[PDB]
Amino acid sequence: STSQVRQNYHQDSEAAINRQINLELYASYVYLSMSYYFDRDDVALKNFAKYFLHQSHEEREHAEKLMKLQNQRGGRIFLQDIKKPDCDDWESGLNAMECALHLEKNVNQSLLELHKLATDKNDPHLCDFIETHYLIKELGDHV
Amino acid sequence: QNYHQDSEAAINRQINLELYASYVYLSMSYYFDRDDVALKNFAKYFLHQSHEEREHAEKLMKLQNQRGGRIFLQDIKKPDCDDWESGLNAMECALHLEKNVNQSLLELHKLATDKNDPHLCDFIETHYLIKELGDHVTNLRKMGAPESGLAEYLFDKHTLGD
Amino acid sequence: QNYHQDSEAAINRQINLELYASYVYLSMSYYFDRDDVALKNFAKYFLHQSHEEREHAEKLMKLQNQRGGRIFLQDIKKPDCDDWESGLNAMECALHLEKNVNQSLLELHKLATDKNDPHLCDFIETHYLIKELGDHVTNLRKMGAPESGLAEYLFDKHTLGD
Amino acid sequence: STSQVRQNYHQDSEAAINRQINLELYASYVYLSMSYYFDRDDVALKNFAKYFLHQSHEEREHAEKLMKLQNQRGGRIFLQDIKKPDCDDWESGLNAMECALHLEKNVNQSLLELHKLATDKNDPHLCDFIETHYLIKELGDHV
Amino acid sequence: QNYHQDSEAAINRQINLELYASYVYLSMSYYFDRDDVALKNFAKYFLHQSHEEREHAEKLMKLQNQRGGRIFLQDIKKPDCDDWESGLNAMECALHLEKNVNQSLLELHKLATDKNDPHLCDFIETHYLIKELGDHVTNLRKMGAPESGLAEYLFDKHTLGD
Amino acid sequence: QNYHQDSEAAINRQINLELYASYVYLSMSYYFDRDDVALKNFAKYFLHQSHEEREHAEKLMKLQNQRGGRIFLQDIKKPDCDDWESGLNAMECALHLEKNVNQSLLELHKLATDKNDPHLCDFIETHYLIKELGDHVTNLRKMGAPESGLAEYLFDKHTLGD
Ligand SMILES: [Ca+2]
Ligand SMILES: [Ca+2]
Ligand SMILES: [Ca+2]
Ligand SMILES: [Ca+2]
Ligand SMILES: [Ca+2]
Ligand SMILES: [Ca+2]
Numbered sequence: 001s002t003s004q005v006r007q008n009y010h011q012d013s014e015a016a017i018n019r020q021i022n023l024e025l026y027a028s029y030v031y032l033s034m035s036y037y038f039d040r041d042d043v044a045l046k047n048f049a050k051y052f053l054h055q056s057h058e059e060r061e062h063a064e065k066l067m068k069l070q071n072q073r074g075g076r077i078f079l080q081d082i083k084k085p086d087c088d089d090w091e092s093g094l095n096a097m098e099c100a101l102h103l104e105k106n107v108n109q110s111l112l113e114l115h116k117l118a119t120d121k122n123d124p125h126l127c128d129f130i131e132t133h134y135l136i137k138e139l140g141d142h143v
Numbered sequence: 144q145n146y147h148q149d150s151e152a153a154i155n156r157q158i159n160l161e162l163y164a165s166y167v168y169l170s171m172s173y174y175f176d177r178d179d180v181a182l183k184n185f186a187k188y189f190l191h192q193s194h195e196e197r198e199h200a201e202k203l204m205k206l207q208n209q210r211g212g213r214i215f216l217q218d219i220k221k222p223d224c225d226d227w228e229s230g231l232n233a234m235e236c237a238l239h240l241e242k243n244v245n246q247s248l249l250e251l252h253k254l255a256t257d258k259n260d261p262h263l264c265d266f267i268e269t270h271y272l273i274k275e276l277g278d279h280v281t282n283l284r285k286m287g288a289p290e291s292g293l294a295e296y297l298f299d300k301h302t303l304g305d
Numbered sequence: 306q307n308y309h310q311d312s313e314a315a316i317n318r319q320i321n322l323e324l325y326a327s328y329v330y331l332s333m334s335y336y337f338d339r340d341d342v343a344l345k346n347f348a349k350y351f352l353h354q355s356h357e358e359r360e361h362a363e364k365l366m367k368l369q370n371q372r373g374g375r376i377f378l379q380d381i382k383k384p385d386c387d388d389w390e391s392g393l394n395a396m397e398c399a400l401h402l403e404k405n406v407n408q409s410l411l412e413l414h415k416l417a418t419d420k421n422d423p424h425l426c427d428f429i430e431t432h433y434l435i436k437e438l439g440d441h442v443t444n445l446r447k448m449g450a451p452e453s454g455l456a457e458y459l460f461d462k463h464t465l466g467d
Numbered sequence: 468s469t470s471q472v473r474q475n476y477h478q479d480s481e482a483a484i485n486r487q488i489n490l491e492l493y494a495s496y497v498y499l500s501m502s503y504y505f506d507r508d509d510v511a512l513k514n515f516a517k518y519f520l521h522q523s524h525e526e527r528e529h530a531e532k533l534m535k536l537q538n539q540r541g542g543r544i545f546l547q548d549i550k551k552p553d554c555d556d557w558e559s560g561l562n563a564m565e566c567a568l569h570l571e572k573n574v575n576q577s578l579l580e581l582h583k584l585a586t587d588k589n590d591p592h593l594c595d596f597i598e599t600h601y602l603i604k605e606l607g608d609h610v
Numbered sequence: 611q612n613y614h615q616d617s618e619a620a621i622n623r624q625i626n627l628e629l630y631a632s633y634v635y636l637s638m639s640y641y642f643d644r645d646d647v648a649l650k651n652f653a654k655y656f657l658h659q660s661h662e663e664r665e666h667a668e669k670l671m672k673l674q675n676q677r678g679g680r681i682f683l684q685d686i687k688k689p690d691c692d693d694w695e696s697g698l699n700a701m702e703c704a705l706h707l708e709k710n711v712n713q714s715l716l717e718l719h720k721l722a723t724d725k726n727d728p729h730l731c732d733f734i735e736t737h738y739l740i741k742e743l744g745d746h747v748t749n750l751r752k753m754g755a756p757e758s759g760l761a762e763y764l765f766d767k768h769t770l771g772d
Numbered sequence: 773q774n775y776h777q778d779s780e781a782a783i784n785r786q787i788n789l790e791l792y793a794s795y796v797y798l799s800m801s802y803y804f805d806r807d808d809v810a811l812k813n814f815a816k817y818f819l820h821q822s823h824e825e826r827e828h829a830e831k832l833m834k835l836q837n838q839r840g841g842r843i844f845l846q847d848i849k850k851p852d853c854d855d856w857e858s859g860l861n862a863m864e865c866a867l868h869l870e871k872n873v874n875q876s877l878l879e880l881h882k883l884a885t886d887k888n889d890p891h892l893c894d895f896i897e898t899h900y901l902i903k904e905l906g907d908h909v910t911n912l913r914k915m916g917a918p919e920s921g922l923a924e925y926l927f928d929k930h931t932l933g934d
Contacts, residue, residue: 005277005340007242008249025381032363033378040370042887051609053363060359064331064352071339072274079332082324082381092586094598097605098579105572112565119559124252125270128263131561138564141608142518258509277340285454294455301462472645472906474871475878492686499668500683507675520668527664531636531657538644539903546637549629549686591881592899595892645906759914760923767930 006074010121014075016114017066020107022080024063027107030085031056034100037090045093052100059107062133069129108137146254151212153251154203159217160244161200167222167240168193174227182295184303185230189237192272199265206261229289230298231280238276245269308416313374315413316365321379322406323362329384329402330355336389344457346465347392351399354434361427368423391451392460393442400438407431473541477588481542483581484533487574489547491530494574497552498523501567504557512560519567526574529600536596575604613721618679620718621670626684627711628667634689634707635660641694649762651770652697656704659739666732673728696756697765698747705743712736775883780841782880783832788846789873790829796851796869797822803856811924813932814859818866821901828894835890858918859927860909867905874898 035052038045070077087099111134118126168189175186207214227233248266255262282302286294330351337348369376389395410428417424444464448456502519505512537544554566578601585593635656642653674681694700715733722729749769753761797818804815836843856862877895884891911931915923 003277003340004238004280005273007245007273029378029381032366033376036366036370036376039367041373044887047610051606064335067335068338071335072270074340076339076387077332077335078387079328079383081383082328084378084380094579094582094601097601101572101575101579101605105568108568112561112568115561122249122253124249124263124266128267134561134564138568139518143514258511274340278343281341281343282458286458287455297455297459301459470645470906471867471909472902474874474902496683496686499671500681503671503675503681506672508678531640534640535643538640539899541645543644543692544637544640545692546633546688548688549633551683551685589878589882591878591892591895595896645903646910648907648910760916760926763911763915764926764930 003074003076005072008121008123008125009073009075010117010123013114013117013121013123013126014070014073016110016117017070017075018078018080020110020114021063021066021070021077022082023107023110024059024066025082026085027103028056028059028063029082030087030099030103031059033085034096037096038093043093048093062137065133073125108134111137147212150251150255151207151210152215153247153254154207154210154212155215155217157247157251158200158203158207158214159219160247161196161203162219163222164240164244165193165196165200166219168196168237170222170225171227171233171237174225174233175230182230182299184299185233185295188303189233192237202265203262230295231283231288234276234279234283238273238280241269241273241276245273309374312413312417313369313372314377315409315416316369316372316374317377317379319409319413320362320365320369320376321381322409323358323365324381325384326402326406327355327358327362328381330358330399332384332387333389333395333399336387336395337392344392344461346461347395347457350465351395354399364427365424392457393445393450396438396441396445400435400442403431403435403438407435470541470543472539475588475590475592476540476542477584477590480581480584480588480590480593481537481540483577483584484537484542485545485547487577487581488530488533488537488544489549490574490577491526491533492549493552494570495523495526495530496549497554497566497570498526500552501563504563505560510560515560529604532600540592575601578604614679617718617722618674618677619682620714620721621674621677621679622682622684624714624718625667625670625674625681626686627714628663628670629686630689631707631711632660632663632667633686635663635704637689637692638694638700638704641692641700642697649697649766651766652700652762655770656700659704669732670729697762698750698755701743701746701750705740705747708736708740708743712740776841779880779884780836780839781844782876782883783836783839783841784844784846786876786880787829787832787836787843788848789876790825790832791848792851793869793873794822794825794829795848797825797866799851799854800856800862800866803854803862804859811859811928813928814862814924817932818862821866831894832891859924860912860917863905863908863912867902867909870898870902870905874902 031052035049035056037043038048038052067077085099087096089095111130115127115130115134118130172186172189172193174180175182175189204214223236227236245266248262248269251262252266279298279302283289283294283298286298288294288298334348334351334355336342337344337351366376385398389398407428410424410431413424414428441460441464445451445456445460448460450456450460498519502516502523504510505515505519534544552566554563556562578597582594582597582601585597639653639656639660641647642649642656671681690703694703712733715729715736718729719733746765746769750756750761750765753765755761755765801815801818801822803809804811804818833843852865856865874895877891877898880891881895908927908931912918912923912927915927917923917927
């Protein structure tokens with residue numbers, strides 16, 4: 001049945017949170033793979049390796065913030081497999097960039113979708129959360 | 144527009160609710176001060192929170208005046224009971240109360256839809272308080288409260304000391 | 306020599322295992338974050354260890370590239386269960402898991418026989434973790450876990466606080 | 468006929484450059500509109516207004532770099548209308564963010580497409596150019 | 611009062627006109643960048659002015675919001691031609707364009723009659739630009755432009771260098 | 773793999789080409805030094821560029837040795853003519869020559885496909901030189917060169933002075 005702390009928390013969102021959790025975990029895994037792509041002698045770009053190892057950790061940090069929110073609102077966390085990343089051709093280093101481009105847009109979009117859902121269901125708490133979480137993603141790199 | 148008088152009332156309603164909660168936690172605190180109860184950190188916990196709720200209410204009054212509204216004060220009702228029976232009970236009631244106060248608080252937001260969004264910060268705070276009280280209820284239960292006086296003793300020390 | 310492709314695979318295998326353990330302890334942690342469990346130091350303990358296992362995996366990836374191998378990533382399987390039932394259970398599972406991970410890790414060493422002996426330090430570390438989890442299981446049991454919620458409460462404080 | 472400076476410059480690219488020119492000009496115009504959205508008293512976020520006015524100018528700066536490249540290689544510049552931006556609902560300030568999200572991805576993607584084209588046509592000069600131009604777009608905000 | 615919507619439109623109209631001019635001078639500049647033209651100071655001159663016109667337009671947008679109006683953006687039309695044939699031509703067109711833009715700009719003032727008189731400074735600036743372009747046309751003509759490529763060469767250096 | 777001997781030859785080929793261009797611009801320069809020509813800034817311009825091309829060639833030799841190749845030197849052919857007739861001609865020839873040298877240079881890149889991508893910087897530089905010479909041809913033509921000695925005089929001063 002229902003957790004004692006649950007208020008105004010729709011079950012659709014509980015499910016969408018869980019979806020975004022796995023997605024950020026996926027994004028973490030992808031960045032991680034991208035990092036060690038640039039680490040190999042065949043490539044040997046230490047700057048990029050530095051960057052994506054940082055991006056990987058931030059995504060996982062973002063994932064755990066979602067998890068903390070779930071338990072906070074009363075929802076329940078169901079973890080799924082973290083799929084090995086599907087971007088194949090890293091021969092050019094630009095295809096790797098293209099991978100991240102689609103990954104970012106996807107991750108950011110689901111957040112936006114998660115926000116419309118939050119607005120539909122009249123949950124102000126969840127709306128404030130996503131906005132922050134989102135602006136941090138896009139605008140965290142600046143100030 | 145009924146909006147201005149709808150909100151000015153929803154504010155006045157929320158003001159009396161936060162004052163109510165203030166009174167409630169005030170009662171709870173001194174329940175743990177009495178010598179047949181004698182849990183000092185339960186007492187501290189609620190007196191602190193009682194002051195939190197009072198601060199919230201004063202902020203809402205400053206808001207009303209900021210927005211040009213008029214403050215209509217209502218009586219502050221004595222809380223349901225003066226004997227709270229146990230720490231787990233008092234936590235359980237507070238869990239209930241915060242959820243009910245959060246209810247109207249939410250109603251307050253959906254009706255406003257400000258550019259200013261002033262009270263959203265206190266709305267974020269209530270959700271922390273809720274998760275905490277649930278956390279606290281959960282722990283007292285698994286420890287054997289209310290019937291085990293030891294459990295509440297060790298909780299007063301180990302959880303509510305730090 | 307199959308050796309280079311045998312090791313490059315044993316590495317790729319160990320990488321996915323450490324990532325797996327990372328996922329496992331991550332799940333365990335937030336199990337203790339939920340309000341029907343509410344053990345903060347159990348949660349901290351596993352989140353820390355989850356990060357340890359992730360660090361281990363990244364090191365193994367840097368090794369693979371150092372040795373000229375190729376990293377073949379595999380899916381990270383969801384852990385066996387999402388409800389760990391109790392602190393003693395979660396410790397017991399982790400004890401099992403570290404022993405299984407240590408198994409292949411050992412296989413990894415006997416197959417290498419390097420001059421460099423790189424991973425021997427992390428091999429030494431797993432044996433500390435094993436003795437610790439055993440120590441932790443042992444203590445929760447003698448205290449009356451899982452069925453005594455008090456035991457796990459006092460363990461969360463006195464053992465996992467310091 | 469042919470400009471005296473033209474070498475290894477395919478006509479497909481000449482056309483794709485011209486397409487990306489108008490696109491960055493469009494992106495400039497969009498950011499410009501987004502800026503003064505946050506400038507109005509109804510909204511009044513000076514930080515965001517500051518940011519998009521900066522992003523607008525950078526996009527136009529990017530456009531002119533493409534123009535300078537065209538003339539450099541021998542191609543010819545054909546300007547098209549800069550379409551007024553089509554994102555309608557700015558009531559939420561998150562829909563404005565969503566606008567930029569799609570705009571960035573679009574702009575960045577055409578660059579990537581322009582790079583594949585450059586690789587197909589064996590133009591190393593144009594490949595180096597886009598890569599830089601692209602990394603500047605994505606990774607300029609950091610270092 | 612149609613006044614508020616008359617002005618808010620006259621502003622929106624002027625905004626698109628200054629953006630148009632910005633586009634025009636932008637086109638003119640890179641016309642002189644191409645290798646079959648190759649006049650660098652003609653190119654500089656117009657790119658600068660193109661930025662001037664853009665600055666003007668952004669100022670008008672800040673005005674609209676200041677006055678509580680709403681900004682209605684319209685497409686920015688490609689300029690009449692992409693090949694400007696000569697420096698004297700491009701000057702001649704710009705002379706025409708500034709006079710036309712000045713026309714509506716004037717209309718904008720007579721309709722406002724502010725106490726604030728905000729745009730009067732940019733109105734004073736256009737009249738300088740007009741006298742300058744006329745000065746520039748005049749000089750290229752007496753030198754033998756467009757047909758004399760030398761004239762435009764020496765003008766690009768001696769007039770548009772300093 | 774023919775690759776190593778294909779590239780080592782494409783390098784040796786490019787080396788002789790850059791040396792050739794060096795010789796060419798060297799000839800052009802002192803053509804403008806002679807007293808029946810007497811354009812000092814044309815002379816400076818080409819002597820500078822002649823040194824640029826020589827620098828390029830030495831860099832390519834350092835590359836060959838870096839990559840383990842062997843440098844096979846060939847004769848440096850006298851340039852096509854010793855009398856360049858005019859500044860516009862000499863610019864026109866140089867435009868042709870850089871385009872031809874750029875041709876093989878491109879061939880050099882598509883055949884390499886390095887991780888190191890060493891010569892890409894000099895490839896970027898040739899494209900600037902090409903646009904410049906075109907710019908220079910264009911300007912001399914519109915001024916009335918070659919037949920107008922004044923045009924080339926004023927170009928030597930105003931364009932090739934600064
Ligand atoms: Ca980030
Ligand atoms: Ca409250
Ligand atoms: Ca491990
Ligand atoms: Ca940027
Ligand atoms: Ca103007
Ligand atoms: Ca060269």
